[PDB]
Amino acid sequence: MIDVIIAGGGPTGLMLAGELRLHGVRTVVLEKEPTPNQHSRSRGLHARSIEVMDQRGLLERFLAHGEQFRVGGFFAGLAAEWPADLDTAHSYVLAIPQVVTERLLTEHATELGAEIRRGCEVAGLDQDADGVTAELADGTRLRARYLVGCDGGRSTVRRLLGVDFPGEPTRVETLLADVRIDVPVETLTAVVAEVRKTQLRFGAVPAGDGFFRLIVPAQGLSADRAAPTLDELKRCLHATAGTDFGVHSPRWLSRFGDATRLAERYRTGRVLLAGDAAHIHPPTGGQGLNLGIQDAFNLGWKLAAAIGGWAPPDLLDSYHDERHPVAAEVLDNTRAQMTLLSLDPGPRAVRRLMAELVEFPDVNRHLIEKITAIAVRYDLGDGHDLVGRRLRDIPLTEGRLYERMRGGRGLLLDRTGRLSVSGWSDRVDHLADPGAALDVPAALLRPDGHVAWVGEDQDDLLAHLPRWFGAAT
């Protein structure tokens, strides 16, 4: 029997598939497209995702396929420098196109034994006390214990579950086009800089083969929501830039709206949602793929614990509880960034103010910690300030913390010489290293790297172990 079916083999589904396979969960990914999508949305990973890749031994291959940037501009285009003191060992943006990210994640899930089935479109579902059935559009059916809808912003699974998707509708649309041009790049660049004085929803990024990615505001809102024609792209370039640059030969035409919507329940019985299936928002700040990877990283070890039979009874519900608030904050911060890009005089004045404020290092750091997700803190109810936050990478006596996390178990980082995870050692590794560079006596880490407990008293540690790791054996 299949343990988990994943509907959708985008970055979220593929990441989830890898996390599940770490625990020997039998995982089948049903991806509707017969061949990988060739057009990239995402342009890169942010620090929390880069950390996550390094905790799973994937960072070397991501670095080998991308370029590291430390530049300003990630929060609503607000120019700065990169913050000097961001609290991560991975303080950069990894520019890497989404197609490449999906290739790396695909090759990793496949090598861990996930079964990826392309050309398989989930059309229907049926669940009961014991499992879930997925019905494919070709009439075939698959049974598993759980089903996770990782099937993007127009998720079939979300619709079939009848999960509400409340939020703000699209009010502002933007065109995206991969096109050739008929002006020299220096001419394109000169005009773009003049426009971007005021309209920051505009630009042109070379693909390095003579094509350019043009971003240009739409005129109004479209009834269809269909992709724009070349004719509409030209009208929009004329309106914003005063020229269409002789654009021709499009190889991709797209439109995106600024709606911010969040699934009301991430879990419905044995079916969950993750990634764009659970939340949509503007690309301002480059956050969605990152958010989805982190959804998968939250969910995977929990679902694995439930399949393994040791998950405490509330564990799976803690996926919604922790991740739904996080997405709500991304959605809000993208509403704020879109307002900072508005040409209306009030917003332009607020933008000038924000430009003054981001010269303060605390502000610049705050906005980038927000964007890059390194300061996410779940409410795991304790006082100690580290509890609920992920722990950054730190040097050990030999090596580093993230090197020890590649199995995806919990980890007790113990500097006291005195604690013990006996009873849970099959689920929690004991990293007994007084030399570790972390100024607490000990920290219990969940498999997602978030701190569940900080302290130095064995009895207290025994009290917190079952919450995340179930019963002693």
Ligand X SMILES: Cc1cc2nc3c(=O)[nH]c(=O)nc-3n(C[C@H](O)[C@H](O)[C@H](O)COP(=O)(O)OP(=O)(O)OC[C@H]3O[C@@H](n4cnc5c(N)ncnc54)[C@H](O)[C@@H]3O)c2cc1C
Ligand Y SMILES: CO[C@H]1/C=C/O[C@@]2(C)Oc3c(C)c(O)c4c(O)c(c(/C=N/N5CCN(C)CC5)c(O)c4c3C2=O)NC(=O)/C(C)=C\C=C\[C@H](C)[C@H](O)[C@@H](C)[C@@H](O)[C@@H](C)[C@H](OC(C)=O)[C@@H]1C
Sites of contact with ligand X (CB under 6 A): 7-13, 30-33, 41-44, 98, 121-122, 150-152, 156, 176, 256, 275-276, 283, 286-290, 292
Q: Where are the beta strands (DSSP E) in 194-275?
A: 203-206, 212-217, 248-257, 260-262, 267-268, 271-273
What angle in degrees, to the nearest 10, is found between the helix axes of 288-308 and 11-21? Answer: 30
Residues 353-372 touching its own copies, rule: CB under 8 A, are 353, 356-357, 360, 362-363, 366
Interaction mask 265-304, ligand Y, x per CB under 6 A = ------------------xxxx------------------
Interaction mask 163-202, its own copies, x per CB under 8 A = -----x----------------------------------
Pick from 343, 301, 330: nearest CA to 318: 301
Interaction mask 178-207, ligand Y, x per CB under 6 A = ----------------------xx-x-x--
CA gap 319, 309 in Å, rounded: 17
What does 31 bind: its own copies, ligand Y, ligand X, none (CB cut-off 5 to 8 Å by kind)? ligand X
Torsion of CA 369, 370, 371, 375, to 10 degrees: 60
CA gap 176, 257 in Å, rounded: 11
Residues 62-121 touching ligand Y, rule: CB under 6 A, are 69, 71, 73-74, 93, 95
What angle in degrees, to the nearest 10, is found between the helix axes of 98-111 and 11-21? Answer: 20
Amino acid identity, position 294: Q
Please report how close the Cβ of residue 79 comes to its own copies at its closest, in angstroms.
17
Residue closer to ligand Y by CB (options 8, 283) is 283
Q: Which helix (H) or strand (E) holds 410?
A: strand 410-414
Amino acid identity, position 241: A
Amino acid identity, position 220: G
Please report how close the Cβ of residue 339 comes to its own copies at its closest, in angstroms.
3
Please report how close the Cβ of residue 176 comes to ligand Y at its closest, in angstroms.
6
Is residue 176 a contact residue for ligand Y (CB under 6 A)? yes
Residue closer to its own copies by CB (options 26, 366) is 366
Residue 40, judged by CB atoms within 10 A of its CB (0-12, 13-18, 19+), counts as middle
Q: Are 288 and 276 in contact (CB under 8 A)?
A: yes
* Residues binding its own copies (CB under 8 A): 168, 332-333, 335-336, 338-340, 342, 345-350, 352-353, 356-357, 360, 362-363, 366
